[PDB]
Amino acid sequence: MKGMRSNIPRALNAGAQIACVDNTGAKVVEIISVKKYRGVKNRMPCAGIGDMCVVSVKKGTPEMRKQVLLAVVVRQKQEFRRPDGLHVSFEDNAMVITDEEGIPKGTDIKGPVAREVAERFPKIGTTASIIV
Amino acid sequence: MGRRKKMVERVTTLMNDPQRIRNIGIVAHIDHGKTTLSDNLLAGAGMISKELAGKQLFMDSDEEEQARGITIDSSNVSMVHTFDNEDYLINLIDTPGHVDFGGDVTRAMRAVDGAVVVVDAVEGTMPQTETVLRQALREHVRPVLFVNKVDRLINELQVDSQEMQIRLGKVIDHVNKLIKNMNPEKFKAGWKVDAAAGTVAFGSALYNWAISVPMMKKTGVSFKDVYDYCKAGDMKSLAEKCPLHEAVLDMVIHFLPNPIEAQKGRVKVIWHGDENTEIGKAMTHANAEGDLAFMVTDISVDPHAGEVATGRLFSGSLTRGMEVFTSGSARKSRVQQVGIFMGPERLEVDKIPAGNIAAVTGLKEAIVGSTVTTLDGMTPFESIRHVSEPVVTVAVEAKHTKDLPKLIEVLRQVAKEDPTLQITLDEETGEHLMAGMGELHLEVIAHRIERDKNVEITTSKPIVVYRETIKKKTEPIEGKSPNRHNRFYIYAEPLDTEIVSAIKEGEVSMNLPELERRQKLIDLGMEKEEAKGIVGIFNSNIFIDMTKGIQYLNETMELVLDGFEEVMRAGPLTREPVANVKCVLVDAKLHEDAIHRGPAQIIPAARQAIQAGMLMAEDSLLEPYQKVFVQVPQLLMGGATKELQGRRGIILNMTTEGDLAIIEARVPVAEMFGFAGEIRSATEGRAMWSTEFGGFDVVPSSILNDIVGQIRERKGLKKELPKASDFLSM
Amino acid sequence: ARFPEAEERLLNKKICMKCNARNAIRATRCRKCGYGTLRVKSKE
Amino acid sequence: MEQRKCYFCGKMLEPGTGKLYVKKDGSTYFMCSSKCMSNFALGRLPRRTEWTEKGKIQLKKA
Amino acid sequence: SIVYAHFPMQVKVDGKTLIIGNFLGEKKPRFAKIIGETKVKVSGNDVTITGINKEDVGQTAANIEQKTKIKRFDPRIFQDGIYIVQKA
Amino acid sequence: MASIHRPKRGSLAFSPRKRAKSHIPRFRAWPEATGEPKLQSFAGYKVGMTHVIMVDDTKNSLTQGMEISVPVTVIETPAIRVAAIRAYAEDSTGEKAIAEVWAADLDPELKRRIPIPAAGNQAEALENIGKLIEEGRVSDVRAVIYTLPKSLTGVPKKVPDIMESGISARDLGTKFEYSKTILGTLVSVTDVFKNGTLVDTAAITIGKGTQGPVKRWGIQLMKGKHSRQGSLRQVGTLGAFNPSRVSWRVPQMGQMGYHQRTEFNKRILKIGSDGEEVTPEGGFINYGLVRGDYILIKGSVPGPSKRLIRLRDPIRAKKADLGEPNILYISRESKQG
């Protein structure tokens, strides 16, 4: 994918139940695997901001639940550094449902998104109300 | 008076200016920015205020077309170019340059008088190119070649000036060969082309430079020089003094025939009516006359605008408030938006006599391919119907249980994309009965699915569905009640073919004057009494109430009707939909009170009887046919035909014109599978088939047993069926 | 198009039917393995 | 070079250091140090904390 | 001979090597090594290779022909390259 | 058995991992001469790390042109003295030292390292070397140099460090002439390296003493139930049954750190003369303040503070002429804060 300007620690590993913050009907999704991630022996799949993960909808509507979907993490509590040396951290972790190409299934994103994801996937930025 | 602000003014009166009017099209291949040079003809060339012109590829009425190197559908506009100090109205009606586009391409060409050529450098007369030259030849739409972006040959491949344009001199020669071989007579009749004589241009649409001997000379930058300038790298500065638009326009005015000339041309061949009425005369010999002789080319729309059904004013005049019929019925609607496709849209107006375009709105019930005219349209161009449905579908599955959710959106949505895909989307096991009637239809959507959304699903084999029907007049069968209190003596019999066609068209409507309908029925043939007793119709089957005396019956009609309907949904023989079957209630015997007249007693009786009736009436089955318009190369006929005939295909027309043998044969869908497959070997890899729902005919009696057998198991039904007596269990 | 002088060098050789090695047009035997049957390279 | 002020102590963020903290409602706060971040997360207020500039302002209000 | 279908080969001599630019649209030119005192002349659409050593002339021609090899596609469709029409 | 594979724990490219035999890194290779004569190496002492705000001038980078915070290592680099010229003869058995000429006057504190060579034969030694070069007995020439750490205050030592450096020249005669010019002089780091250029840094790494295989090689710990059965930080197996021996490739405890390491392509971001520009408030912790001329090396460097760091012109540099960095801000805030 296109490189991000910031250095992102892959903070969320497989099994994490993240709140889903769009209007698709998925409330909580559990990370199953990370796309484009090859691991090593004994290492759980890891994801930071800007990564696309295969997720399972654990809470939400009956249509969303039990579905294998693609999501992009837009907020992470683990601090990441911008190129100019400033460290950024969010109050929670948050993801949004997308396709393979990066288009969000939802139409509006409640909460701030990271500028890194906003630039890597421009449609997430337009869908989000504010980009931090 | 901001550009188009002036145009508007001139245009409103320009309408009745055929002399300068220039309704034309553009035909060639794709991936040659053909629809993009046409974007720049007027929108690109700022025919409106520059900010509001071609900035965001808005020119074409069908905005979505954008640019892929060729027309997408049949969008429309206008451009008032000046040539030798005169503002000619070059209504750009760029014609779709493809092959699949068919019965609609006909009228999408009738909208113009000349389709124009565009072939990028050493691309040549591609298979498609020649295909659209063939289609062009039909609608007498004279062309002019526009060899786009020769840059390839130039800068990239560097073929010396002379050579460079000699390759095109030959290409021109091939366009002449096209207009010779194909239709030899056509040639001399203006259709001839030539760079020298001026009826051929060239130039990069993406770089907007362009020339042609006339242009060449006038500008003083001969093609040789232009080569030198391109090669050098200044194609943009070249464009400046050789405006891509200009050339094209110049030719449309001068060389490219002004509408008037071949105003007739098209009609006769394209029109299937009397080309000698007021309307006919006007449309042919460039005149207005013809009581609002508009032609619904493509039923369109626009947000808070009107049903902008396109139709260049090939004859007549426009005004706001004209009760206009249609080529389907007599709707009669206020025609408020008699405007002209102008700027990057369709400038709505009123006063538009014959000459330019004539997209009328105010409607909401016609068909893409109608010919809406105030005049009582006896035989309008594509006088056609539309009553049809796919009958051989498949069972879209899911290679991965993870794509199911997605698949769900994919398929439920697809309706939007195409409503001809009646996606019978079951819900339990989910064997999604994705519409279809033939192999074409099958793959048609195949890709769509795996491209407009992309899913990991698959398909099964053709669902060989049909329409159950009978063939023999039976003898009154009594349908008793569960509680053995009531009774109904109903008889069944074949539905007359004339009647069949009648209701297949739909004219025979329930919401219709009795007296009136009655006459129609008698007309067809059904005797007076029987024809008057008709209560209801389902699908293409009629229930006749030819009884007299039974008290409290019409208060039961509901029930009995429904009973009938039910049977009509599910055959008594193959459990398949029933069509073209006439049922007639002779007698009855209902219980006095209402207690013993509930649905639970009525409905069975009716069902029972109707069904049994069918059984006894030598119930067979119908089968859809699909007219195979197959444009095999003229020469090729032996093999071409042999194929069809062998696949039990009742041969129809051979259509031998110039170098094109279009052998239709309304090939029974039964054996209408792998047409292209066979073709590639039968005709040494040379044939262009295309199919269309030929209609429901009788499945060959000989193979009935087999057919039924199959159907029975395919659905999962007992080998034998309740033979008469048993289903009629007294 | 297809150029004869390019075709002479590209498509005008024999192929061993056991190891697929190219051999001369006149060769009756594979040079790599000595197989006695060689087919012309399939140019269609 | 963006000049940033610590939300808690009111000190200028020295370039190449410091943190930005974002709440769910989009509210952004610059923190000069882990000390300021911890005191903000404890619910303590700068105006009540004496070593910060807001605490100093509150005290000098009298 | 020099033959191509769509991309015009830019063939020249830069000393003891032959530069073959735009070979099948490539942005990186091919390099063919010259052997001995072998004189290579690009006389338009053809190449003449004169020398005093048959070994050197044959190896120079072989170097050209192998540098102009299409090592990926079907040879029955893709035939671009420089081919010997006459051996030493 | 169907086995799960993993890359081997640690690198066998640095075996045996023993203590370096000296506290000074020795260069085994010298790069190609590509211009005017000059020394190919310098030597300074690591002070510590800070960070700068600079405009990204790196061509093709995504953040090029914008403000970026870059960590830098400060290396205090007093002028080195060119003590001697040594000539090397190449034969089948390799290079041998054939001649050496010491400078006539040398610093008195050199006696802490060696008994001082007298002011004896320098003219005739140089003419002997010239005769050897003319007759072809000399394969190349190197300059023996030494540092003068007495001028520093964060480095407690006054005994100089001595090391050989290559000379970069197009020909052996040019090398000899340049060495004669520079012999006995005091060379500044600007006479060896220029700002914005790439270099290779060699140093003795931080010593950690004796370390277990977990820290030394990065082997996994015992996991789950095995974590508390008595072998937690301890290798699972020393070998198979056969061969009947422990391989040298099995990760084991031993000396960790205090090895020679070379880092490649460290960019010089600033050549400074006044240490007040870089010294923070309160000084560098356990070091003090910079007083002489210094160098800023982009990124990290092997070795702790006060370790001798050898800089040499790059031997595997990829990028061409990089340019002069635009340092917009050097952080002098307290490192102890």
3-state secondary structure B525-558: CCCHHHHHHEEEEECCEEEEECCCCCCCCCCCHH
Name the closest residue on chain D to residue A83, using Cα atoms.
D16
Closest CA to E25 of E11, E12, E10, E7: E7
Contacts of E8 in chain B (CB under 8 A): 156-158
Minimal CA separation from E54 to chain B, in Å: 35
Q: Do A5 and F53 touch (CB under 8 A)?
A: no
Minimal CA separation from F313 to chain D, in Å: 29
Q: Any chain C CB within 8 A of the CB of E75?
A: yes
Technique that determined the structure: cryo-EM
Instruction: Return d(Cα D51, Cα D48) in angstroms, integer.
Output: 9
Contacts of E87 in chain C (CB under 8 A): none
Contacts of E65 in chain C (CB under 8 A): 9
Contacts of D19 in chain A (CB under 8 A): 79, 86-89
Q: Any chain C CB within 8 A of the CB of E72?
A: no
Beta-sheet pairing, B200-203 with B145-148: parallel
Instruction: Return d(Cα F191, Cα F199) in angstroms, integer.
Output: 14
Instruction: Return d(Cα F75, Cα B192) in angstroms, integer.
Output: 84
Residue type, D50: E
* Greatest CA separation for chain D: 37
Q: Do E76 and C44 touch (CB under 8 A)?
A: yes
Contact between residue B139 and residue B110 where contact means Cβ atoms under 8 Å apart = yes
Minimal CA separation from D35 to chain A, in Å: 15
Backbone angles phi, psi at B123, to 5 degrees: -70, -45
Residue count of chain E, please give it: 88
Instruction: Return d(Cα B223, Cα B122) in angstroms, integer.
Output: 16
**Residue in the structure block whose two tokens are 């020295």:** D14
Q: Do chains E and C meet with 3 or more Cβ pairs nearer than 8 Å?
A: yes
Minimal CA separation from B403 to chain A, in Å: 8
Instruction: Return d(Cα F192, Cα B519) in angstroms, integer.
Output: 113
Model resolution, angstroms: 3.5
Instruction: Return d(Cα B511, Cα B515) in angstroms, integer.
Output: 12
Q: Any chain A CB within 8 A of the CB of F53?
A: yes
Tell me the count of C-E CB pairs closer than 8 A: 28
Name the closest residue on chain A to residue B403, using Cα atoms.
A68
Contacts of E81 in chain C (CB under 8 A): 6
Beta-sheet pairing, A46-47 with A12-13: antiparallel
Instruction: Return d(Cα F86, Cα F140) in angstroms, integer.
Output: 9
Subunits in contact with chain C (3 or more CB pairs closer than 8 Å): E
Contact between residue B521 and residue B534 where contact means Cβ atoms under 8 Å apart = yes
Instruction: Return d(Cα B2, Cα B23) in angstroms, integer.
Output: 25
The number of angstroms, rounded, from the C-alpha of B163 to the middle of its chain's C-alpha atoms is: 43
Instruction: Return d(Cα B255, Cα B411) in angstroms, integer.
Output: 50
Q: Any chain E CB within 8 A of the CB of C2?
A: yes
Per DSSP, B33 falls in state -
Contact between residue A14 and residue A48 where contact means Cβ atoms under 8 Å apart = no
Residue count of chain C, please give it: 44
Give the three-state DSSP class for B374: coil
Give the three-state DSSP class for B138: helix
Cis peptide before B214 (omega within 30 of 0): no
Q: Any chain A CB within 8 A of the CB of D13?
A: yes
Contacts of D23 in chain A (CB under 8 A): 90-91
Minimal CA separation from A67 to chain B, in Å: 7
Name the closest residue on chain A to residue B407, using Cα atoms.
A67
User: Which string of DSSP letters, residue by residue, matches B470-528?
Assistant: --S----EE---TTSS---EEEEEEPPHHHHHHHHH--S-SSS-HHHHHHHHHHHT--H
Q: Which two tokens stand for residue B260?
A: 């008037």
Q: Any chain C CB within 8 A of the CB of E3?
A: yes
Give the three-state DSSP class for B56: coil
Q: Do E75 and C11 touch (CB under 8 A)?
A: yes
The number of angstroms, rounded, from the C-alpha of F200 to the middle of its chain's C-alpha atoms is: 7
Q: Any chain A CB within 8 A of the CB of D29?
A: no
Can you point out the beta strands (E) in F56-139?
67-76, 80-91, 94-102
Q: Do E7 and B158 touch (CB under 8 A)?
A: no
Minimal CA separation from E35 to chain B, in Å: 31
Minimal CA separation from B159 to chain E, in Å: 9
Q: Which two tokens stand for residue E37?
A: 């005192």
First to last CA, chain D: 37
Beta-sheet pairing, F67-76 with F294-298: antiparallel
Instruction: Return d(Cα B486, Cα B618) in angstroms, integer.
Output: 27
Sequence ranges of the binding site of D for Zn(2+)? 6, 9, 32, 36
Contact between residue E22 and residue E8 where contact means Cβ atoms under 8 Å apart = yes
Contacts of B122 in chain E (CB under 8 A): 6
Q: Do D15 and F69 touch (CB under 8 A)?
A: yes
First to last CA, chain E: 15
Name the closest residue on chain D to residue A89, using Cα atoms.
D21
Which residue from F62, F69, F223 is facing A84, i.e. has the nearest CB?
F69
Contacts of F51 in chain A (CB under 8 A): 85
Instruction: Return d(Cα B71, Cα B96) in angstroms, integer.
Output: 5
Residue type, B518: R
Which residue from D13, D17, D19 is facing A89, i.e. has the nearest CB?
D19
Instruction: Return d(Cα B115, Cα B96) in angstroms, integer.
Output: 9
Cis peptide before F243 (omega within 30 of 0): yes
**Mutation target vs A (from F54, F63, F227; most A CBs, 10 A cutoff):** F63
Q: Any chain F CB within 8 A of the CB of A110?
A: no
Name the closest residue on chain D to residue F69, using Cα atoms.
D16
Q: Any chain E CB within 8 A of the CB of B19?
A: no
Instruction: Return d(Cα A122, Cα A117) in angstroms, integer.
Output: 8
**Mutation target vs B (from A32, A33, A57, A67; most B CBs, 10 A cutoff):** A67
Q: Do C5 and E81 touch (CB under 8 A)?
A: no
Can you point out the beta strands (E) in chain D?
4-5, 12-13, 19-22, 28-31
Q: Any chain A CB within 8 A of the CB of F63?
A: yes
Non-local (6+) Cβ contacts of B115 within 8 A are B24, B25, B26, B27, B95, B109, B132, B135, B136, B139, B141, B142, B143
The number of angstroms, rounded, from the C-alpha of B27 to the middle of its chain's C-alpha atoms is: 19
Q: Which two tokens stand for residue B95?
A: 């014609």
Which residue from A86, A92, A129 is facing D20, i.e. has the nearest CB?
A86
Contact between residue E40 and residue E15 where contact means Cβ atoms under 8 Å apart = no
Sequence ranges of the binding site of B for GTP? 28-35, 94-98, 148-151
Closest CA to E83 of E70, B246, E73, F117: E70
Non-local (6+) Cβ contacts of B672 within 8 A are B438, B439, B626, B628, B647, B649, B691
Per DSSP, C14 falls in state E
Instruction: Return d(Cα B590, Cα B558) in angstroms, integer.
Output: 14
Q: Do F6 and A3 touch (CB under 8 A)?
A: no
Contacts of F67 in chain A (CB under 8 A): 83-84
Contact between residue E23 and residue E29 where contact means Cβ atoms under 8 Å apart = yes
Name the closest residue on chain C to residue E85, using Cα atoms.
C5
The backbone region for F60, taken as left when phi is positive above 0, alpha when psi lies in -120 to 50, beta otherwise, is left
Q: What is the Rg, in whole angstroms, of the alpha carbon atoms belonging to chain C?
A: 11
Name the closest residue on chain B to residue E25, using Cα atoms.
B156
> Treating both helix axes as pointing N-terminal to C-terminal, what angle do B161-177 and B223-232 enclose, rounded to 10 degrees?
120
Name the closest residue on chain B to residue E6, using Cα atoms.
B157
Q: Any chain E CB within 8 A of the CB of B157?
A: yes
Contacts of C5 in chain E (CB under 8 A): 1, 3, 83, 85
Minimal CA separation from F322 to chain A, in Å: 20
Q: Do F69 and A3 touch (CB under 8 A)?
A: no
**Residue in the structure block whose two tokens are 């450098």:** B121
